[PDB]
Paper text:
The initial model was built according to the phased electron density map obtained by using anomalous scattering differences of selenium atoms in the selenomethionyl L24M crystal. A final model for native PedB was refined subsequently to 1.6 Å resolution against native data. They are arranged so that α1 and α3 run in the same direction and α2 and α4 in the opposite direction, forming an antiparallel four-helix bundle. The relative disposition of the four helices of PedB is maintained mainly by a network of hydrophobic interactions in the core of the molecule: Phe17, Leu20, and Leu24 from α1 (residues 9–26), Leu48 from α2 (residues 31–49), Val61 and Ile65 from α3 (residues 55–72), Leu74 and Phe76 from the loop between α3 and α4, Leu84 and Ile87 from α4 (residues 80–92) form a hydrophobic core. The C-terminal end of PedB (residues 94–112) that is thought to be important for immunity has no electron density, suggesting that this region is flexible. Deletion of last four residues (PedB1–108) resulted in severe loss of immunity compared to the wild type PedB, and deletion of seven residues (PedB1–105) almost completely abolished the activity.
In general, type IIa bacteriocins are coexpressed with cognate immunity proteins (pediocin-like immunity proteins) composed of 88~115 amino acids, in order to protect the organism from the antimicrobial activity of its own bacteriocin. Based on the remarkable degree of sequence identity (~99%) of PedB of P. pentosaceus to that of P. acidilactici, we regarded PedB as the immunity protein against pediocin PP-1. PedB is a small positively charged protein with 112 amino acids and belongs to subgroup A. No transmembrane helices are predicted from sequence analysis. The 1.6 Å crystal structure of PedB reveals that PedB consists of an antiparallel four-helix bundle with a flexible C-terminal end.
Residue numbers in the entry: 7 to 93
Write the structure that this text describes.
């Protein structure tokens, strides 16, 4: 299904957006999470929906840990990843 590409596109879109801040250090962990989600999905591990769930949960958690403040656009993509991870 095209669900795989859908997931990859959401992950890369978010990676792009997260690099638009004044610094990148506070976002590196989240970028690592996305790179890993992309690798796992590219290598067909579990399902794209499962990888999206993990990416979303890990980013939501890190946002607490690194006190991250996402933009409307970033939150929109994150919500889309959460949605995909539910259906």
């Amino acid at each position: 299904e095209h669900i795989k590409q859908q997931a990859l596109d959401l992950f890369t879109r978010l990676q792009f957006l997260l690099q638009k801040h004044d610094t990148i250090e506070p976002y590196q962990y989240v970028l690592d999470i996305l790179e890993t989600g992309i690798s796992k999905t590219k290598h067909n591990q579990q399902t794209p929906e499962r990888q999206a769930r993990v990416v979303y949960n890990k980013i939501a958690s890190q946002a607490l840990v690194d006190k991250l403040h996402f933009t409307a656009e970033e939150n929109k993509v994150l919500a889309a990843i959460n949605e995909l991870a539910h259906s």
